[PDB]
A paper describes a structure:
The asymmetric unit contains a dimer of dimers. Therefore, the native arrangement of HNL1 is as the dimer like the modern hydroxynitrile lyases discussed here. The catalytic domain consists of residues 1–107 and 180–265 and contains the catalytic triad (Ser 80, His 235, and Asp 207) as well as the catalytic Lys 236. The overall structure of HNL1 is similar to that of modern hydroxynitrile lyases HbHNL, MeHNL, and BmHNL. The larger phenylalanines in HNL1 push the side chain of Trp128 out of the active site by 1.3 Å as compared to HbHNL (1 Å relative to MeHNL), thereby creating a larger substrate-binding region in HNL1. In addition to a larger substrate-binding region in HNL1 as compared to HbHNL, this substrate-binding region is more dynamic in HNL1.
A reconstructed ancestral hydroxynitrile lyase, HNL1, from the α/β-hydrolase-fold superfamily is the focus of this paper.
Numbering used by the authors:
A (entry chain A): 2 to 261
B (entry chain B): 2 to 260
Amino acid sequence: ATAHFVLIHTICHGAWIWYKLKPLLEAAGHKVTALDLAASGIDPRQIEQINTFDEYSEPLLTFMESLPQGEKVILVGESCGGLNIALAADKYPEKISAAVFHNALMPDTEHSPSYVVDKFMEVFPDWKDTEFSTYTSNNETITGMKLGFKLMRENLYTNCPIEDYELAKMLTRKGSFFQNDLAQRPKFTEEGYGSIKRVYVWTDEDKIFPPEFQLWQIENYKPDKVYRVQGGDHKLQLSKTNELAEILQEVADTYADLLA
Amino acid sequence: ATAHFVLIHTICHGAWIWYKLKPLLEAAGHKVTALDLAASGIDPRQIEQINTFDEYSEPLLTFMESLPQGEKVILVGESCGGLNIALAADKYPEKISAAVFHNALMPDTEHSPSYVVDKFMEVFPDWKDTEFSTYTSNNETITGMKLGFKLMRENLYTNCPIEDYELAKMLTRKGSFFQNDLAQRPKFTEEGYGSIKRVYVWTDEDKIFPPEFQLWQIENYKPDKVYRVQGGDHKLQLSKTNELAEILQEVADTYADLL
């Protein structure tokens, strides 16, 4: 009946983006964990101390690590959260009943983990008022980004009520895609990430991931189930929280373990 | 009449708390500023790096200093934000058209700046699952606190939409009253803080500042005006956002100068 959902935010965001989905899922009896990834939300590290996508994803992987033996979770990742979900799946495929991508980057096993990032960066090249910066690890320069207010308003939170946008102004922080780290890491494997069930949730009104890109990702790495939500925007957990919850219910009804 | 409201959160919280009130005020034409104090919200410092009430308050004092000459603000402070308001008022009285205390601590000028914190701590001595810790700085011992989830749900966010409680759990951080530092500070001045207009907004359903403590505060240092909100809880900016906005529009009409 019920599942354990692990909700995973995108870059520049935090656990807080799930403030309205989480209690909605709890009403149905589900367990929900919403994590801050490294240097995200109220984690104390700044992004400039995080060197790799692996470090960035550490709170998810140590949560997965600690899951008692036999317990499984449905991972839910928005936007870049998709990447994290694949990393987690590649190390802990036995601990995952499914992974849901909601307006999310959905990597494959055939190409470099950067593949869908590189493709996204080519089809959405106008960041508006976003500010870009750099910092260094011992041997690499990493690009950081602080999302611009006008980008957020117009492209992310387009049909979210104004308070969500206000909240995002109050809480978003400097993040990174770790694109170059992604381009040089080992591909995700068929036995890890390639063995889990994948559900892909999207809307064609997303003003950041346009429909030909999302259609492209679906075709590139065919998921087990696709759900297209009408209207809304990039932040479906904000703009269409109830519908998203109803889809997550059905995903739990399919993939969650049954109890004796 | 419009105003420039400066909204000041309590300890363990941040600017985020104002996420529903800010846009509501803005719709009426007001300018709103909502700041993160030191080591709060997404400020990058941890509370264990902050030694004094002053240091804690620094982003509000900085913003007041920055205010172009002639401009005035209406300060609004929730809970322990009322102590920051008093510190600001004492340094920049002439920049303050009024100070609004929203179920807030409201210090005076006759007693030590800690006085209402000391009283509060006797009136509400059970903090449930709140975690208390100390840290060291210089030659002082300082108490940190991380609000318990149960204390927050039962006593702070009791009539708030469930999603606001959920935010709180995702965002609240370790904070401090800096009680010891307030006990040794010089008293607020009659000429500075004592000269500003103070509006006191409250509800008798607040489950952390109960009514006999709020009445004690109002009796101790009589405000210029009182508004009592029916229902709600300690977090009126989330539980009664619209009625708070309406009160603030009236405070603006009364206090905020004609150009």
